[PDB]
Amino acid sequence: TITRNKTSDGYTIITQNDKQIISYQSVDSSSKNEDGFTASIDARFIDDKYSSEMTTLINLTGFMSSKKTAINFPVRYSISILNESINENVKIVDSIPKNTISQKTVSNTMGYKIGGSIEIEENKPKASIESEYAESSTIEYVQPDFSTIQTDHSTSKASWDTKFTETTRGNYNLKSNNPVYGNEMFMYGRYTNVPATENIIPDYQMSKLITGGLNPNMSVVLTAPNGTEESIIKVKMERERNCYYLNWNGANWVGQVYNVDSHIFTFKINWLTHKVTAI
Amino acid sequence: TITRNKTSDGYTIITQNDKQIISYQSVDSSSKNEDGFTASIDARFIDDKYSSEMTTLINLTGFMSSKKTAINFPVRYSISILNESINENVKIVDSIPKNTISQKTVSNTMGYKIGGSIEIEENKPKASIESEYAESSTIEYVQPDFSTIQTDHSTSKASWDTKFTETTRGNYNLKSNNPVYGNEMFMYGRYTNVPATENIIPDYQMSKLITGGLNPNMSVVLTAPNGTEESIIKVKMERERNCYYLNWNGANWVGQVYNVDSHIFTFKINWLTHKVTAI
Amino acid sequence: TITRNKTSDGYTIITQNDKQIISYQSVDSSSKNEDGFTASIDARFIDDKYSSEMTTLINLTGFMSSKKTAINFPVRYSISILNESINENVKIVDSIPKNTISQKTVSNTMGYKIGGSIEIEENKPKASIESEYAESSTIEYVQPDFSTIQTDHSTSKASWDTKFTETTRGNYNLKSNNPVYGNEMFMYGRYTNVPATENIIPDYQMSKLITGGLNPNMSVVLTAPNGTEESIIKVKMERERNCYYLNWNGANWVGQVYNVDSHIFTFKINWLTHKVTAI
Amino acid sequence: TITRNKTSDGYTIITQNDKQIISYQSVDSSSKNEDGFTASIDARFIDDKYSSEMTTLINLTGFMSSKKTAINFPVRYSISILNESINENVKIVDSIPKNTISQKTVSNTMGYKIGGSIEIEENKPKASIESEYAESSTIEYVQPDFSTIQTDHSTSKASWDTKFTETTRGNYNLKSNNPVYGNEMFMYGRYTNVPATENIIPDYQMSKLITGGLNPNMSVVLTAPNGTEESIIKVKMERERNCYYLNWNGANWVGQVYNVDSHIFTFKINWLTHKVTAI
Amino acid sequence: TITRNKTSDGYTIITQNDKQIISYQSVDSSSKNEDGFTASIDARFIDDKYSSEMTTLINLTGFMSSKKTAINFPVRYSISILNESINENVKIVDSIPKNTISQKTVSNTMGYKIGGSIEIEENKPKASIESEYAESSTIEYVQPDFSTIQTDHSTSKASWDTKFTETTRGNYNLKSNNPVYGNEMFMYGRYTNVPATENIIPDYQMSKLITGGLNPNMSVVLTAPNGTEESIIKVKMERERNCYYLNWNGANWVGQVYNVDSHIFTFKINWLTHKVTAI
Amino acid sequence: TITRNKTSDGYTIITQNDKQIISYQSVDSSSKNEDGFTASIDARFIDDKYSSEMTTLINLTGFMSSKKTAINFPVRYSISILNESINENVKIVDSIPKNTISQKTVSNTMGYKIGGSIEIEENKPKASIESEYAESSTIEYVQPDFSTIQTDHSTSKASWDTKFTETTRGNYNLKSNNPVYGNEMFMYGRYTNVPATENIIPDYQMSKLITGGLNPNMSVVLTAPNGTEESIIKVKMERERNCYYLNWNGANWVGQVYNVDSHIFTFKINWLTHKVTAI
Amino acid sequence: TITRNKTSDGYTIITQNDKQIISYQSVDSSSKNEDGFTASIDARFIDDKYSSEMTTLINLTGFMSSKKTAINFPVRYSISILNESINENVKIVDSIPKNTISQKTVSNTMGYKIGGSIEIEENKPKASIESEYAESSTIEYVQPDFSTIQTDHSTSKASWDTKFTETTRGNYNLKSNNPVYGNEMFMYGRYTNVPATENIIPDYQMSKLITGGLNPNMSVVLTAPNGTEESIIKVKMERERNCYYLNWNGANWVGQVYNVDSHIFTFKINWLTHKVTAI
């Protein structure tokens, strides 16, 4: 699979190799500083001699910053990729993150005990017999701090999102309700008797994704028939947040839990020149 | 992919190989001894025949020393990388350290017990029946001594930082408060009755990052269109510290916890000559 | 990347390979027998066709012997590497040993129990109900016998040191104080009633680094602009020791814990001839 | 890196390869049957085109047999390698066995329990409340049966040794002392009432190194400037032993614990001819 | 490192490769059916262009069968290899099986408990306080069923042997002595009341090496100066056995424990012709 | 190590490679359906340029079916390979399955407890002190369901066999004897009160080797001097079985345990033609 | 091992490689929809230059569907492969699935406890001494849900089968019998008081092989002398099923457990043309 050529001047020889798979890579980035939204697209174009149609791989990356008495704290992120050239026969054949099935560990035990006691006192007998029976079981599983679920996949739209799950210490969630303390999420001490600002929980116990932004990684595969030259890609990003509130109720420290930011980014693809640009 | 040439004098043959990916590497360092701040930049330039634009990888390393009655002890470090040639279309497409999601291990068990005892004394019966029911659960997780969170990523600025977390022995933190002993961080004995200097805790129990400086490792990827010749990189470093205080309260040994150093370094990049220098 | 040549006499052919990275290695050693100090420097010179400046790797090794009623026993070692050609633009860009962050394992459990007992005697009832509640937690970590902390890194000086930590049996340290036995480090039996020399602890329980010397391993990277021919390297070594004392207090065996050796070694480097020598 | 030659007679072609690293190996052995001492030296000579000086690797192996009422039993071995050509600039740059730092596993737990019991008798109440608090910790480590410590390293002399540590069953050592049984090392039964010879402990429980000899493995690296032709190596071997004694004290079986063999071997090295011989 | 030659007839080309290390292998076996002794020697001859002397590797294998009221049962095996050409400068430089050092696992724990109970009866107080303290330790190790110890190594003789250790069930050994049952090795039931032959223990619980023979694997390295042509190797094999006896003592089943086979094999080696034969 | 040749017609070139080790493989099978005995021999012939004598590897495989109130059930299998050409200097140098040494895990623990209780009643003291001491040990090992022991190895005969060991549930064996239930091997229920045929144990609990036949794997190495042309191999197979019997004894279900099949197969080997056939 | 040829027209060169082992593969399938029986045969033909006879590998695969108050549920599957060309010297030398030997884990422990209590009341002593002794053991093993046993292997016939074993929850089997509940296999609740159809057990708890069909994997090796052209292979498949029945007995829910499908498939093999077809 080599092509060679000789020359008269100096007997120069120029050999070249004929390869099967050739890829090209281009990257593009864009940002909206007012919302703390940044997105990058990495595109790879694959030239294969045995394939019937053109293939482009569209990786996505970026940063969604998380913003931070009462404290505002995010609760949900959402990312969507839209194919806007459907009438040109450009199609979304695959998306990398997928849904999986969890595993649980189960154990069961059953036991029997029997005991006989003879007690000889001074010329006095006390015979006692005892019997016991027991059964138990154990369940084990593993719990992430955030959960990512693919929600849609079609010829034009792939949509993913993530949501708040639970705290590592105390196992509280957004729906808990203690009769006299309300919601004890992000509460240090019930009776510390210090200013509200000082009663909040140390930051390190909070998840990294609440203090700092999420870092997406998503990939989509596109194909097209021979000759296609242009394509538009739209990326939609949404963020939802809520607020936690803490106050006095007599001597008790009690709390309670009660907008949406979004932006659309556009990119243009050139298949013939192997180029990706912002638009 | 080889180019060969012959010569008349001695039939000398000079073969050369044509490769796809060629990299170049240059390093530069600088320091500010008065603050104990040192920074190094390692730059790699990548020449790829199939890529549409130039790529430079900018690794960063350095040393931030930690300085050390009352004892001063650091509490937070912060590093920021700034791209200052935005109007020339030089862009930050990627940053290596990222945010991750932790895992927790959860177990639950439930059990039942039943017991029957027959006690025959001298012509005296004593029948007793007992019943028990129990439930329990266990949570497991892993805790670092320091925590690093990425806080910003954009076209121009990437900012990281680290903060104090907790002690390995005693699990104290910066917000603890015992009613009669105050804060027991870095306290050997409550009643040792020795001079204040002697009551401090042995150094080895303290984290390495408090006794000795942090060693950063950060990487940033830059790209540019064809022909770009120059670029300015700014690196900002900040350190925050606080003080611990211990005194007598009658017979009790009690304690309490109550500036910011910074510097900006500048580097110049030459794309055409593959050079990095201080400035 | 091959250069070939033919000859008339016997048609002798001499082929040579053109390689990218070429390294050279030289080693040098020196000692001071009076103090039991020995040091060795291994230098590697790297010739790279794609690098902008010369690089030399300076590994360091050696032996610091530990010297050994009252017994003298070391407590701290310290090593420092000094670059003495700063005005010639020879710079220390990297040092291999670094500071790291430890990990802790944390577990928490909470449980509930309930029990009902019915006791039918001869026409006599005795109903009893019991209830229990419990909580606990466990912390795990790992402890070395000696600890090495990097204390300084700059353009000219890199300084490391090591210190005594604790005993494997008994978990004593240099600051412990029992009211009636004093310090029980290196004490076999409180009441053995044998001569002082015989009451010391068997040697094997002591750490290897106290009975025998430390074996350093340190590496430093140096770079220089084209044409540099000479460089001076200074290596400083210090050792600190203390004494343990044991005596009678009536029938009780009690103890207590109450100079500094140093030397500077010099080496000369020749970049052009790829040579390292003592000086 | 190939040299080729053609010939007229039969067109014979003789190709040779030019390699970078060439090693040579020679071995020599010697023994002293009266003391059960045997020693072997394996020497490797390295020819490197990029090294500034000659290097020889001197591995050492051998057998030191252990000799075996009262029973004689070894307690310490010692090996030393001496370089006797210091005035010719032949130097010991490295020795393979080194000192290492051990690891300990530490755990701590704290727990709380609370219990309330209500006991209704025939019109009689008996309310009881109980409370418990507990704390504990665990230490784990690993213990060899023999211990090897490097004791000296210098330009001329490297010295190692090994010593007896403890028994696998009973954890006795050379300094133990029971008031009425003395030392119970190597004692089967306190009251077996059989002849002294029969009361000794079965051999298999004893360590292999006491029943049979130690098998040393030691390596030393030597270097020299160009042109060196000869070198003398001295190997010193010492063995220390003691005796265990057992007798009657009324009905009790009691015991107690109360020379040095050595030899020097000589070897001659020839650098130019790559030869090692006894001398 | 290739030698090539051309020919006129048909332009036949015969290329040969010049290799550095060439080995030759020959095997020989012999047996003595009357004693169930079989031995095999595998010899490998190594031709190395960079070595100063000839080397031969002498592996050994074979079968020693174990022979089997009163039952005869082996207790010790012994193998020895003798070099009988010492005056020709043929020497034993190495032997493969060696002595090793075992490892033990040690743990220690200490705990404290405290408990307070308040008991309010009908106008009657019963205050009780309890306190507990505990300490414990654990030792772990691993035990083979047979043990192999190298006992001698010299210029002429290498001698190994193996001995009986203990039973897997019951942990008995050759020196145990129960006052009323004697030795309970190989005894099924104390009171089974069946004929002596029937009271023996099932065979599977016995070690494989007692029911069936040992399979030795031993290796010895020999070297010689240039020109050596012949060598004699002697292999000595010994086996020791004892007897177990069982009888009635009233109603109790009691037992007690109270020649040597050997043979010498001879082999002849031819260095020049690379041959091994029986003799 | 290549031989090449050119030709005039079409310039045809025929290259051949000269290799060191060449093997040949032939297989043969035979059966005796009346006894359910099948045997296969796989023979490999090795041609080595550096070996002094010819080598043949004789693998063996086959099937021995197991045959199946009173139930017949096998108890022992035995396989023997016989070399019948001893007078032609054809010898058995090696046999693959061998005897091995097992491992046991041993642990020991010792602990001390002490407790002091103070009980203040209404003006009544009850001081109690308690003390405890405990010791324990644990033994672990692994148990196969069948056991294979090599029993003989010589110049002419290699003999192996396998025997019944124990049940996975209940740990019974062939020598157990309960006073009132006899042998409880293969008994479902003592009082099920169903026909004898129905009281047998479900088949799955029985070992696979009793329900279905054993699958042997044995290998033997033969060597011979140059020129040998023929060899006879005899394979002997034996199987032993016994019977289990169950009956009523009043209301109790009791049991008790109270020929030999064999065949010889013959094979012929041709060394010169590399052939194996039945005979 | 290459054959090359040149040509005049365009100097075309056609090189071919001579390989040692060449394989051919053909597959064939067939089904009987009325019984849900499907079978596939994959045949591989091996041409080896060093083998004395032809070899064909016959893999087998397929699907046997399982069919599903009273519920019919399978209980046994059986597969048999028949060689029908015995008189042509076509022979079955090997079959891949085989019988194996299981492993059990056994542990034993023995312990001793001793306790002394002193109780000083108001001028009243109560000395109590207690003693305890205990022994225990543990057995571990692993249990599949279905079991496959090879039952026959001969020159013409290889027969395998599988059978029902036990339930994962409750450990019931086909022979269990509770006096008042009968067989509790596939029974949800004893007193649920819902229609019979509703009391059956949820499907997921049942084994996959009962709800869905078995997927066989079997392989057989055939050999033949040179020149063989045709061969017939017969595959026999059988399935056995039974029924479970449940009804009322007063207030109790009780149950009890009380045809055979088969088919023969035929395939034809062509050795010379390397073809497999249905017949």
Numbering used by the authors:
A (entry chain E), B (entry chain F), C (entry chain G), D (entry chain H), E (entry chain A), F (entry chain B), ...: 8 to 286
Paper excerpt:
In the present study, we describe the cryo‐electron microscopy (EM) structure of CPB in SMA discs, which likely represents the membrane‐inserted pore form, at near atomic resolution. Further refinement and postprocessing resulted in an electron density map at an estimated 3.8 Å resolution (and EV2E and F). This allowed us to unambiguously build a model for the CPB octameric pore except for two loops in the rim domain (Glu76–Ser89, Ala283–Pro287), 4N‐terminal amino acids and several amino acids with unresolved side chains. Overall, the CPB octamer forms a 123 Å‐long ring‐like structure with a widest outer diameter of 97 Å. While the N‐terminus of Hla is located inside the cap domain and wraps the vestibule‐exposed surface of the adjacent protomer, the CPB N‐terminus protrudes from the cap as a short hairpin, which assembles to form a 16‐strand β‐barrel. We termed it the N‐terminal β‐barrel protrusion (NBP). It goes through the 25‐Å long N‐terminal ß‐barrel, the central large 72,900 Å3 vestibule, formed by the cap domains, and the transmembrane β‐barrel. The narrowest points have a ~ 6 Å mean radius and are located within the NBP at the level of the positively charged Arg11 and Lys13. The wide cap vestibule features a balanced amount of positive and negative charges, while the transmembrane β‐barrel is overall negatively charged, especially due to Glu152 and Glu162. In conclusion, the CPB pore has a C8 symmetry unlike the C7 symmetries of the homo‐component members of the hemolysin family and similar to the enterococcal EPX toxins.
